[PDB]
Design a protein around this nucleic acid. Structure first.
Ligand SMILES: [Zn+2]
Ligand SMILES: [Zn+2]
Lengths: 124, 337, 38, 145, 123, 48, 97, 131, 102
RNA sequence: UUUUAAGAACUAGAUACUAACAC
RNA sequence: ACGAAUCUCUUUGCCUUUUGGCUUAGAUCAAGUGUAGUAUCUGUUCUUUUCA
RNA sequence: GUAUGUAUUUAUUUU
């Protein structure tokens, strides 16, 4: 069950502007590009006539910790790459904040679960 | 704190009655490792054993009704359905084997422990088995489709007893890492720990009314209330250890078996320990083989059932003479904890 | 190198795993409904 | 059948893979959890802490006690805490009657001759002849006393 | 600050509460209660089992058993339509059997709270 | 396809569905190559 | 004969290990002075990372194995980390010279 | 022996693979966790040392000497606050053992800082510990 | 006689490092705050960079002297007793444990 | 500030372990 | 005088690299041959120092 | 008579 239950975390930009939308739910989709575990995939075309189908690349466990739109992979709030946003937030303050992430295999898988969020997220 | 100690010289507890030995039923050739008795008609034991049989004795007469055999390894544990005519008996081959009494035959093998299973109990109102054992996880087996619906996480060690309770926290379980977890199944995890015991917690029991759980230890036997998970009382217990079992009752008598061969009865309210008995071990036994491996009280409250490592069952009777006449026991000298 | 075990495998190490999907034999539905006492 | 074969060629076989007790691998179980269930009790008769080395080595006393009781060794370890020695006597009785009991049952499976396996024969002569001599030495001793 | 330091443990939890009065009462858990815990469990379980059967591959297990998205504010509405398989192709395209170890995550601690001369003679 | 997907290319199904090794087998390549009481049963079935 | 026999307690397997391990160490030493003499030519050839066995195999050097964020806490360390980094960059930055 | 960073590197990787093999087979054998922590200090890398201890605690919290050595591992690098936070989690985790309270004390006496040891003994008395 | 409880022992060691600490302070006479954060729950204490280093150094030298007691104890103990049979090191070790018995 | 191997040459083979190598 | 501290040694305490399973003791326990690779056992004879 | 295990880098990662 609960896999559904934290719901999609989705851009309000890339999602496209139209008033009502249809998107699939496929219970065991791809693995994350990151944590490498299953999740529920949401297809969709942005609008109905579109040529290309948005796919969502990661968990809702994984795109929580970093707080990033699962399709976009920008920040949710600032529309900006990780390696920027936590660079800016490195600047103010002075020196801190990078997220050292996960080579090997079950290093990254493991490290996915714990909920501490991450530096870029820490404030946002 | 002295106030606390003046109060304990007041309440002056609750006269209860002595006990003695009515009946000795031999006839297992192993140790006798578990007992459980009808939820309904009080006619029959059900008696685990270390030769792997299960014999059903007859409460009143003492004769032998039947043999339910059919296990490979010894049976540690028995539980008997209330609502269903079932018998869940579990042994150390890593198997929960349902039974059906109506025909005296096996039905469902529940399955999935990594290793042997030291406790069953039957969730009272939901139709679910709860089991657990040396894996250190407490599984909730759904009854009819044999799915281990929930796997409860948990302790660092073997799980000695699981108690299921109808309302919240619904599973109460204690582990040779010396705690008692209190479980909330639906959320899925521990709702409390009760840590105090200084060694393994080798038995529990549920107040048949007041809704609390006596928690044994090795040498000093506490109680606990649910909801808050209080401490409540501490039954004044010198080190007589080790505690094999807890048996509460309808009269709030309490039993606890020792392995030195000493039955220790308590009042429940107090901690006053008002009788101790050497259990005369046996004919040809070996003095180490005096011990007590199990207990229960029948549904009337008046009669005691225990097995003993010397290969026999004993049934103790509540001796009515009592009153005060010269009844009294150890006469209430609460001391320095 | 024969060592007496001192332990057992915590159910947890199992518990984290993802499932399988293999279907065994003895799980085929049987005794599909219970019985109650008066 | 093949439904499995294909989900195994995709999803990889089952990772846990418990097993069960069975015909052959019985003993290692029965033993295994016997000794575990000494090591509770002997772990809880000690007053406080000292455990690991003291424990394991006391188990070595366990085994040594058993294979004494085979060879009939009267097994007095010169000095040693009395209660622990009680435990050893207790269990070795328990396992003992596991042994004698199994020796009867099987011998009277052979007597009917219904499919007792191969090694089970050779073993069973073992358990027997041991038992025969124990009976012997007894019978002589009490012929002394 | 004496609260800042040791902050967790406190003495009211070592103090047995039936020493003051015997006869202190905790009520057996009624009737109009047990039919609640019974409810929330029983429903929740039936959703568990309903799941685990409808995972797997018995074509015959099925017999034995939402708009849901306001995203952002709902801003773009939604409707969530599952995709009918192609029944031969794998179901759960990404399911697999792997192995993890997991972070045991907590903030807080469980104070272990209890109470060598003549004894090591004995033992 | 099942076979070549187990990485056995040295077993050959002829058109009557005999299974013959075309390259005398290195022992490891036997062990990896025992096939199933199913897949054999079903080979035969098709043969009929 | 006997006086020689008593003095080896292990059995064929353990001895076999003693050998295998030493042979590994000769491999190391060799491969090293390979790299050393290549440094005396100045051409710097990187060392291999010895492959994998099971597909998920861990390379421990690369990332913190299982990283437990030590705790929360009231005492606000937050300065000592800079003394750390100063000492660690200091140490590794030394060794390179 | 060692030449540059890269040789030290392989000398680390080899050790870590080996040891954490030997911890991978025995979760117990605490002395192994200790020794491996000690190596991890001699590499002047603390962060890994902190973790390795933390895990070593999640195995068993009732073995004190690992608490102690996970104090002294923080002090011998002359970093205190960690050796404080560790002590809050320590005495709170094990009030009934003395050596924690005494050691946290001495840590506050060699710092001369009294306000602590006052409030400290205020607690460690307030629990009715003993004489 | 004898064995000391792990309690009284920890107290006694507390006394020994008491008096040692006292030779630190007093001998330093012979040879011659707490801030809290309203922003976050963190607390901030100010200490001399002095006496922290005496602390650490003291610890190190303790580890030293103990380490050396153990080492010299290796040397002497393994050189002395010449009686029982020894196949290898661990026969001497363990066997001297069996001598420790009676 | 540490250190010091008796040194060199000549000699036959007995007991040995084993060998997908020869009835 | 004794209080305090460093080093050294003896004694006691604590054991520091200090036996990690089961089944029929798990079962079994000698008669060969030629050559060949490799380990090692003994004799004899001679000579007792330094600097660029 | 054998299982089993090990290495098999060719195509120049910035001073
Ligand atoms: Zn997006
Ligand atoms: Zn993910």
């Amino acid at each position: 069950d609960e896999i559904n239950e934290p719901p999609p975390n989705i851009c309000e930009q890339c999602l496209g502007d139209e008033a009502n939308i249809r998107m699939t739910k496929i219970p065991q989709g791809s693995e994350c590009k990151i944590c490498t575990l299953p999740f529920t995939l949401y297809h969709f075309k942005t609008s109905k006539r579109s040529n290309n189908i948005i796919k969502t690349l990661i968990c809702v466990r994984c795109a929580t910790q970093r707080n990033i739109c699962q399709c976009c992979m920008l920040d949710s709030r600032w529309h900006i790459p990780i390696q920027l946003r936590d660079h800016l937030i490195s600047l103010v303050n002075e020196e801190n904040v990078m997220t050292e992430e996960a080579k090997n295999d079950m290093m990254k898988r493991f490290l996915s679960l714990k909920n501490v969020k991450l530096g870029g997220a820490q404030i946002t | 704190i002295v106030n606390r100690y003046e109060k304990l010289l007041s309440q002056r507890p609750e006269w209860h009655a002595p006990w003695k030995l009515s009946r000795v039923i031999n006839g297992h050739l192993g140790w006798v490792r578990c007992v459980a008795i009808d939820p309904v008609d009080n006619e029959w034991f059900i008696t685990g054993s270390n030769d792997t049989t299960m014999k059903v004795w007859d409460l009143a007469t003492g004769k032998l009704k039947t043999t339910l055999a059919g296990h490979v390894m010894t049976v540690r544990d028995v539980a008997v359905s209330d609502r269903h005519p079932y018998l869940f008996s579990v042994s150390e081959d890593k198997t929960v084997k349902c039974w059906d009494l109506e025909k005296n035959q096996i039905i469902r093998d529940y399955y999935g422990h990594l290793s042997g299973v030291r406790t069953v109990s039957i969730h009272p109102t939901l139709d679910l088995i709860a089991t657990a054992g040396r894996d250190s996880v407490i599984k909730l087996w759904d009854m009819r489709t044999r799915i281990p619906v929930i796997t409860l996480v948990g302790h660092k060690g073997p799980i000695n007893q699981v108690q299921c309770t109808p309302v919240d926290p619904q599973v109460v379980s204690s582990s040779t890492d010396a705690t008692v977890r209190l479980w909330d199944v639906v959320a899925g995890k521990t709702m409390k720990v009760l840590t105090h015991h200084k060694r393994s917690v080798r038995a529990t029991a549920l107040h048949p009314k007041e809704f609390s759980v006596a928690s044994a230890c090795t040498d000093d036997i506490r109680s606990w209330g649910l909801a808050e998970g209080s401490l409540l009382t501490n039954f004044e217990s010198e080190k007589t250890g080790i505690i094999n079992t807890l048996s509460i009752n309808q009269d709030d008598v309490l039993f606890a078996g020792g392995d030195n061969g000493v039955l220790s009865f308590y009042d429940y309210k107090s901690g006053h320990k008002y009788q101790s008995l050497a259990t005369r071990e046996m004919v040809g036994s070996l003095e180490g083989e005096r011990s007590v491996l199990c207990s229960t009280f029948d549904k009337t409250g008046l009669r005691l059932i225990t097995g003993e490592a010397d290969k026999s069952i004993k049934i103790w009777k509540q001796d009515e003479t009592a009153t005060k006449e010269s009844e009294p026991g150890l006469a209430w000298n609460p001391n320095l904890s | 190198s024969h060592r007496p075990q001192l332990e057992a495998r915590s159910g947890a190490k199992a518990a984290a795993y993802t499932p399988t999907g293999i279907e065994h034999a003895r799980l085929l539905p049987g005794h599909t409904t219970l019985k109650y006492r008066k | 059948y093949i439904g499995n074969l294909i989900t195994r060629q995709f999803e990889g076989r089952s990772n846990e893979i418990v097993k069960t007790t069975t015909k052959q691998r019985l003993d290692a179980y029965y033993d295994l959890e016997l000794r575990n269930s000494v090591m509770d009790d002997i772990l809880e008769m000690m007053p406080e802490s000292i455990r690991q080395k003291k424990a394991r080595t006391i188990l070595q006393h366990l085994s040594e006690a058993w294979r004494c009781w085979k060879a009939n060794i009267p097994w007095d370890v010169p000095g040693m805490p009395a209660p622990i020695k009680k435990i050893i006597e207790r269990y070795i009785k328990s396992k003992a009657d596991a042994w004698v009991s199994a020796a009867h049952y099987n011998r009277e499976r052979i007597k009917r001759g219904a499919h007792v396996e191969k090694t089970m024969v050779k073993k069973n002569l073992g358990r027997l002849t041991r038992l025969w001599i124990k009976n012997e030495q007894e019978r002589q001793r009490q012929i002394q006393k | 600050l004496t609260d800042q330091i040791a902050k967790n443990v406190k003495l009211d939890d070592f103090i047995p509460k039936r020493q003051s009065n015997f006869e202190l009462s905790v009520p057996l858990p009624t009737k109009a209660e047990i039919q609640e815990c019974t409810a929330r469990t029983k429903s929740y379980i039936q959703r568990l089992v309903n799941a685990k059967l409808a995972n797997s591959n018995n074509r015959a297990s099925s017999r034995y058993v939402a708009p849901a998205n306001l995203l952002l504010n709902n801003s773009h509405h939604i409707e969530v339509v599952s995709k009918q398989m192609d029944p031969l192709l794998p179901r759960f395209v990404g399911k697999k059997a792997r192995k993890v170890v997991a972070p045991t995550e907590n903030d807080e601690v469980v104070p272990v709270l209890h109470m060598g001369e003549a004894d090591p003679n004995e033992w | 396809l099942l076979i070549h997907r187990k990485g056995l290319t040295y077993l050959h199904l002829d058109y009557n569905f005999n299974l013959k090794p075309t390259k005398t087998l290195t022992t490891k390549e036997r062990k990896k190559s025992r096939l199933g009481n199913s897949f054999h049963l079903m080979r035969e079935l098709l043969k009929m | 004969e006997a006086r020689a026999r008593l003095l080896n307690t292990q059995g064929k397997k353990a001895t076999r290990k003693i050998r295998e391990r030493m042979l590994e160490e000769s491999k190391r030493i060799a491969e090293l002075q390979k790299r050393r003499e290549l440094k005396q030519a100045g051409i710097n050839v990187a060392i291999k990372k010895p492959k994998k066995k099971y597909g998920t195999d861990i390379d421990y050097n690369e990332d913190i194995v299982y990283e437990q964020a030590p705790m929360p806490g009231i005492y606000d360390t937050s300065t000592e980390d800079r003394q750390i980094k100063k000492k660690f960059e200091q140490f590794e930055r030394k060794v390179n010279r | 022996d060692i030449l540059d960073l890269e040789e030290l590197r392989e000398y680390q990787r080899r050790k870590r693979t080996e040891y954490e093999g030997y911890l991978k087979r025995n979760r117990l054998d605490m002395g192994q966790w200790i020794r491996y922590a000690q190596f991890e200090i001699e590499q002047h890398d603390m962060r890994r040392a902190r973790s390795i201890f933390e895990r070593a605690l999640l195995v068993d919290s009732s073995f004190i000497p690992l608490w102690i050595r996970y104090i002294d591992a923080e002090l011998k690098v002359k970093c205190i606050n960690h050796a404080r936070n560790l002590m809050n989690r320590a005495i709170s985790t094990l009030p009934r053992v003395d050596k924690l309270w005494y050691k946290y004390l001495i840590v506050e006496e060699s710092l001369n800082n009294v306000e602590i040891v006052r409030s400290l003994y205020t607690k460690w008395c307030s629990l009715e510990p003993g004489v | 006689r004898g064995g000391i409880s792990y309690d009284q022992l920890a107290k006694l060691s507390y006394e020994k490092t008491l008096r040692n600490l006292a030779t630190q302070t007093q001998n330093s006479s012979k040879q011659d705050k707490v801030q809290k954060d309203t922003k976050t729950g963190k607390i901030t204490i100010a200490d001399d960079d002095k006496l922290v280093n005496k602390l650490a150094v003291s610890l190190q030298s303790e580890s030293k002297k103990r380490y050396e007691a153990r080492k010299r104890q290796m040397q002497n103990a393994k050189t002395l007793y010449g009686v029982e049979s020894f196949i290898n090191d661990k026969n001497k070790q363990f066997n001297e444990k069996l001598s420790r018995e009676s």
